[PDB]
Design a protein around this ligand. Structure first.
Ligand SMILES: CCCCN(CCCC)C(=O)c1nn(-c2ccc(C(=O)NS(=O)(=O)c3ccc4ccc(I)cc4c3)cc2C(=O)N2CCc3ccccc3C2)c(C)c1Cl
Length: 135
């Protein structure tokens, strides 16, 4: 599997959900993602209005979130949360007419997967183990 591809398809789909067209594992991830954000809809709504996304704040938001999310370790719930959060930054990017931020966000999600999560993903059955959770 390829992390960059997984990021790109996921971000494409979330944006597509919202009528914005952007320049197996994917299916499982979005199903997980939808159940995750429906369960925490209120929290995602609070978080959205607090984000004050701009090109100046966006790297810092990303790092703050990701650092808080994985501080105690990694599990699949937290990786689903990580995609949902990325989706939220890209949706908000678009809402506020900072669409070029999407490319940064996608790049940051990829670096962080390849760099810092890849190891744990392997020890836990690769992406295949996650698919043998959602079909
Ligand atoms: C987008 C998430 C990061 C946002 N921040 C920081 C806010 C700005 C600083 C967090 O506070 C944070 N969230 N997690 C979680 C991570 C995982 C879960 C979680 O897994 N919950 S679950 O077990 O009920 C669940 C729920 C649905 C699931 C669906 C599919 C699958 I596979 C697994 C699922 C698991 C909950 C949580 C968590 O604590 N919350 C309540 C806080 C919150 C705030 C905004 C959005 C979602 C959430 C979920 C953590 C550790 C942090 Cl720290």
């Amino acid at each position: 599997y390829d992390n960059r591809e997984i990021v790109m398809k996921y971000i494409h789909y979330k944006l597509s959900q919202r009528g914005y067209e952007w320049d197996v594992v994917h299916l499982a991830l979005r199903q997980a993602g939808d159940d995750f954000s429906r369960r925490y809809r209120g929290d995602f709504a609070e978080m959205s209005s607090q984000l004050h996304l701009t090109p100046f704040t966006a790297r810092g938001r990303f790092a703050t979130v990701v650092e808080e999310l994985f501080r105690d370790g990694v599990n699949w719930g937290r990786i689903v949360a990580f995609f949902e959060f990325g989706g939220v930054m890209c949706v908000e990017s678009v809402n506020r007419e900072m669409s070029p931020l999407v490319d940064n966000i996608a790049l940051w999600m990829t670096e962080y997967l390849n760099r810092h999560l890849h190891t744990w993903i392997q020890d836990n059955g690769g992406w295949d183990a996650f698919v043998e959770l959602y079909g």
